[PDB]
């Protein structure tokens, strides 16, 4: 189990600055959108669960959060967006999850035309790949390859779209 320290007061500042009225519970899952970090100015995703109190529900002197190996769904989850350096104040030692999980909505490799998160998707950088293990790399590569198939299909579709559009424009001059 991977657990790191949580600064609750910093999290309150972060939520309020983002006009999020509600306070999360002990054992509640938070979906995080990291807008930028050490990897680059590209958006990444991480999932966390809050730990405010012990097994007997006695409040912890030093609260924690745990990292959950699951892809974030921004459509259905409690979300917080922001740069890594701002969220590291609340979530101490926050880093990227294992493998393609970092892609969040596209960890499953489901690329869609018109999808905002598909448009915001960016592949891994050289800083990211230097840190990965063999299994991570093979997983990421599998997902990114499926995204590529989708992108190639959209490229050939746009080529036909553009072509037929220029043809109908030419006959009308």
């Amino acid at each position: 189990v991977e657990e790191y320290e949580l600064d609750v007061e910093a999290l309150v500042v972060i939520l309020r600055d983002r006009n999020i009225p509600r306070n999360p519970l002990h054992g509640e899952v938070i979906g995080l959108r990291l807008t930028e970090g050490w990897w680059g100015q590209i958006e990444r995703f991480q999932m966390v669960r809050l730990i405010l109190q012990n097994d007997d529900n006695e409040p912890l002197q030093r609260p924690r959060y745990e990292v959950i190996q699951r892809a974030v769904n921004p459509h259905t989850m409690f979300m917080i967006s922001g740069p890594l350096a701002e969220l590291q104040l609340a979530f101490q030692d926050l880093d990227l999850p294992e493998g393609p999980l970092r892609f969040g909505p596209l960890a499953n490799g489901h690329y869609v035309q018109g999808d905002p998160y598909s448009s915001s998707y960016r592949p891994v950088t050289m800083a990211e790949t230097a840190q990965m293990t063999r299994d991570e790399l093979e997983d990421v590569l599998n997902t990114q390859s499926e995204i590529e198939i989708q992108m190639i299909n959209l490229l050939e579709l746009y080529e036909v779209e553009t072509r037929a559009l220029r043809r109908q424009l030419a006959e009308r001059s």
């Binding site: 609750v8 007061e9 999290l11 306070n23 999360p24 519970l25 529900n57 409040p59």
Partner: peptide, 17 residues
Amino acid sequence: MAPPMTLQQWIIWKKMN
């Protein structure tokens, strides 16, 4: 057992001791 806590509930608790 006590109920699960919100963030503020914890902060208020920490302000006690």
